[PDB]
Amino acid sequence: HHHHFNLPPGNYKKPKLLYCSNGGHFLRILPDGTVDGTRDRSDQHIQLQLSAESVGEVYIKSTETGQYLAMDTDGLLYGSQTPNEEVLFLERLEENHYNTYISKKHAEKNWFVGLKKNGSCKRGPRTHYGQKAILFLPLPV
Numbered sequence: 201h202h203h204h205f206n207l208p209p210g211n212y213k214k215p216k217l218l219y220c221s222n223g224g225h226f227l228r229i230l231p232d233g234t235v236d237g238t239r240d241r242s243d244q245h246i247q248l249q250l251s252a253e254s255v256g257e258v259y260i261k262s263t264e265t266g267q268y269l270a271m272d273t274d275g276l277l278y279g280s281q282t283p284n285e286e287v288l289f290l291e292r293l294e295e296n297h298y299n300t301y302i303s304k305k306h307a308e309k310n311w312f313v314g315l316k317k318n319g320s321c322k323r324g325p326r327t328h329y330g331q332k333a334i335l336f337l338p339l340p341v
Contacts, residue, residue, distance in 0.1 A: 202308055206293040207256055208338075215249045215263050216338040217241075221298065223317035227336070229262040229269060235277040237315040247341050250291070257304060258291045259283065260313075271303040275311050275324020289313060298335040 218227040225237025226246040238246065247263045260269035267279035268287040280287055288304040301313040303324060311324030314333035322333050 203290060203302065204292065205256060206296075208291065208293045208299045210338065212250045212252060212258075215247050215341045217246050217341055218248055218260070218299075219337045219339050220315040220333065221335045221337060222315055222332040223319060225315050225319045227260075227269070227313070227315065229265065229267050229279040231265050231267075233267065233279040235269065235279055235321055237319040237321070239319070250338070253288055256290055256292070257288050258301070259287055260289060260301070269313065271306065271311060271313070271324060275303075275306065275326075277313060277321045294329075294335060299338055300334050300336065 224239055228238050228246045229235050230245055244264050249261050249263050250258045252258055268283055270280035270286040271277050285305050289301040290304055290307060292300050294300040303311045310328055312327040312334040314322035314327045316322055316333055327334055
């Protein structure tokens, strides 16, 4: 248990758009398993449904394709067809306002879900507390 337990409010009743305040991109999981960000609100692959496993743990799934957001052994985000240990994330409040997501499998290395200003995903090892890339706001679809 190497992380704080400040949790964000809100629930998982409805789907959300995960808006990254770093560049204004929405997290996107493409049909081919590619993960990135896009500023296009009309995109059909940015609608995500979150749900809890244990308290503070979440699954982040594409409502369009049914894939799971997942982070691999090298810290790369990818869309997984099935749930495995790489699809669980620790959802936490950050800066008393945002939501951050730490890879459960690699929680000890502080690997976060993050988007760069150019819309490309940050690789696990390149993320850390304090960056704007890891700060998300769940917005209504």
